[PDB]
């Protein structure tokens with residue numbers, strides 16, 4: 001893997017380390033999560049993955065807070081943000097050091113409804129459409145099955161991730177592998193309002209990760225937070241290169 005070029009400037013976050021292909025930031029100040037509302041951390045982080053790769057952005061905490069897992073497109077030159085939701089019905093705080101924020105690369109592939117190309121080219125994921133109307137009540141999870149197999153790509157593995165638009169509205173998708181038998185996709189509404197998602201609405205994205213990026217082995221090179229403990233995410237072995245001019 002060629003270098004991941006990045007810029008980072010944010011007095012409220014500490015760069016812990018950029019090691020073995022993963023950059024990790026930690027919060028230096030208390031982050032308040034109001035209940036029933038989205039909390040968005042503006043990271044002051046900018047990054048460009050090498051050829052053939054996308055970037056994975058995720059948060060880790062032992063507190064009752066769930067973060068959106070972000071898929072970062074190769075063409076994205078804006079600021080990276082972490083989107084957080086509160087699991088509780090009262091204020092939850094992330095005290096200093098309680099939130100870790102990770103960025104790492106992965107190889108992906110692209111096949112040529114319900115699986116759709118986004119209208120902007122070299123994007124990592126393909127939009128997946130809802131097969132039925134769903135009503136998502138506050139602080140509840142709703143699941144839906146996708147049964148028809150996606151195209152098979154040699155040496156790659158279809159996965160499902162959420163998108164940031166619904167995440168901002170309080171709706172998170174739990175990332176998961178789309179195995180041959182079908183996938184049950186779970187949507188959780190962390191807001192106080194009922195969200196009605198209609199049949200055919202895009203509700204998640206399909207990403208083909210190179211098979212090397214999924215492992216059962218725990219190590220400083222993998223993380224169970226992303227897609228869960230069965231399918232550990234093992235990022236590409238890239239080097240981070242600071243390029244200050246990327247900061248906007």
Ligand SMILES: O=c1ccn([C@H]2C[C@H](O)[C@@H](COP(=O)(O)O)O2)c(=O)[nH]1
Pocket residue numbers: 057068069070071072073076079080081082083162163164165
């Ligand atoms: O958690 C995230 C997810 C995405 N993005 C940026 C990079 C993506 O290329 C772009 C669009 O994301 P989606 O709307 O496809 O999720 O927003 C973030 O900053 N944080």
